[PDB]
């Protein structure tokens, strides 16, 4: 059953590596993974506060840092999105990282700037909800964030999706991607997203006009190889106001893939609403009939 | 001397072109209305009435307009009617060998044909940063309308300024910038913003929280060799919602100033408000004391 967890082995390190987290929700969101029986190290400046970050970029690294120092961490769960972890990039000792013990870093909408460095560095990483998720269709919220649990014990391996437009086809690739509006809000600097040859990527936003969410396209897909892309895979786009646009937002996704040759796939539970399902960063998977397996 | 709301007749005849968003049909009359009051000879685009979706026109069709504005031989200087979003989109197209050849004919505008502006100074062709020829059709205002004709005929040399952040010395250098979301929305892409060492850095922004501008911010100086710039001076940021941020614009502002040494300055009258005075984009100027000089 999906709304069932698996146990976690070992311990989850929880670190704040972008926006400031309100006291009552963090509160909240330990009492859910000692609900689940997860054992935790919560970071020592995950309740910092530095405008809307949490925490100077020095305070957010010793906390990252830290999470990779301890033997028995198995899991990064990154506490919330929102906006600032790409400014902790010029600060982050890879070597470190790389001689740790595996330990994936969880997250998404602004976190998928570190999972995609987190690949480039050859680190595991899974895109997923972020752990105050727990700590706020209901049994589609707790879907998602049981799956975070199922996936790092390794007993999902798939997804739902639906291939738009096009011809039948099978694309194998690495699956990258995330947030949209985040990871263009890096091109041109050194976090600019990871996206090797034959990539799946996996695009998803929420809170956008479509004239920012088409400008956002352009520039991520000006800025990478994308006509050596497998596949474009659209996850949800809520809460995006349509305001008279006389073209559907599939309609202008569909013109892009079609300029640059890769097919166009979409209705991934994946993103901002209640559907959130975890999904292996960085890892080979396959588009095959109605399904993005791994 | 004139008043700062007397033009300067404009010789020879004005392409007016929409390379951006499309443009309202009673706007675009009263523009021409106004044209007409100040004796300017203008020539319309065959294709600035052009809808698709949000944008004037396909990339096919704004492309031959501008390529146009360039091919007829009576054109002194081209006035983009609205920037809105998509000048960028025609970057790939663009000719540069035919609008080089072409005798000197400015471009004009703001907001997103900053994408434009900075691709010009790249190609060594004359612009200006002021307001879009809509502007016309819709007291500060109307100097900031005036003063385009009048940075056009050579008569204007000098904008206002105050030192926020920084040494105090003099700075000189090319003029370059604009909107800080079009420039940061360019960044790894062949539209990059064109920042040569020592250049003054205009900035200026609308509609805003404080997290997208310092997002935006953050991308375009890691994007740039910014620890080579001259100098960042700060235009408006109109309607941009503090909403109980601990930190005010010009914190953020002069934080990222001091991290690249860079000295800031701002209120200059220049943005998306009333105050909007022409500048002339890539030339060089002085920024000493309150006054930026060219």
């Given at each position: 059953s999906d709304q069932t967890w698996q146990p976690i082995d070992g311990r989850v390190a929880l670190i704040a590596p972008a926006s400031?987290?309100?006291?009552?929700?963090?509160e909240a969101t330990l009492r859910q993974l000692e609900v689940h029986g997860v054992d935790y190290h919560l970071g020592?400046?995950?309740?910092?506060?530095?405008?809307?970050?949490?925490?100077?970029?020095?305070?957010?690294?010793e906390?990252?840092?830290?999470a990779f120092d301890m033997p028995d961490i198995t899991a990064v769960w990154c506490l919330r999105g929102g906006?600032?972890?790409?400014?902790?990039?010029?600060?982050?000792?890879?070597?470190?990282?790389?001689?740790?013990?595996?330990?994936?870093?969880?997250?998404?909408?602004?976190?998928?700037?570190?999972?995609?460095?987190?690949?480039?560095?050859?680190?595991?990483?899974?895109?997923?909800?972020?752990?105050?998720?727990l700590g706020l269709e209901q049994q589609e919220r707790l879907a998602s964030l049981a799956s975070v649990s199922?996936?790092?014990?390794?007993?999902?391996?798939?997804?739902?999706?639906?291939?738009?437009?096009?011809?039948?086809?099978?694309?194998?690739?690495?699956?990258?991607?995330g947030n949209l509006t985040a990871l263009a809000c890096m091109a041109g600097t050194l976090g600019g997203l990871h996206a090797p040859a034959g990539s799946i990527l996996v695009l998803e936003d929420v809170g956008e006009p479509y004239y920012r969410l088409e400008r956002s396209l352009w520039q991520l897909l000006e800025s990478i190889d994308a006509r050596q892309l497998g596949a474009?895979?659209?996850?949800?786009?809520?809460?995006?106001?349509?305001?008279?646009?006389?073209?559907?937002?599939?309609?202008?996704f569909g013109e892009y893939a079609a300029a640059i040759e890769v097919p166009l796939y979409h209705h991934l539970p994946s993103?901002?609403?209640?559907?959130?399902?975890?999904?292996?960063?960085?890892?080979?998977?396959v588009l095959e009939g109605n399904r993005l397996r791994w």
């Open positions: 400031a987290i309100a006291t009552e929700v963090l020592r400046h995950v309740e910092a506060r530095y405008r809307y970050l949490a925490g100077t970029v020095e305070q957010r690294l906390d990252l840092h830290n906006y600032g972890c790409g400014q902790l990039l010029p600060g982050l000792d890879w070597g470190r990282l790389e001689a740790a013990s595996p330990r994936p870093l969880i997250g998404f909408s602004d976190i998928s700037v570190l999972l995609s460095a987190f690949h480039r560095h050859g680190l595991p990483a899974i895109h997923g909800p972020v752990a105050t998720g199922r996936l790092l014990a390794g007993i999902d391996h798939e997804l739902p999706v639906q291939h738009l437009g096009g011809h039948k086809q099978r694309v194998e690739g690495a699956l990258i991607g474009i895979c659209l996850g949800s786009f809520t809460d995006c106001p349509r305001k008279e646009v006389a073209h559907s937002l599939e309609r202008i993103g901002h609403g209640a559907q959130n399902r975890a999904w292996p960063y960085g890892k080979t998977a």
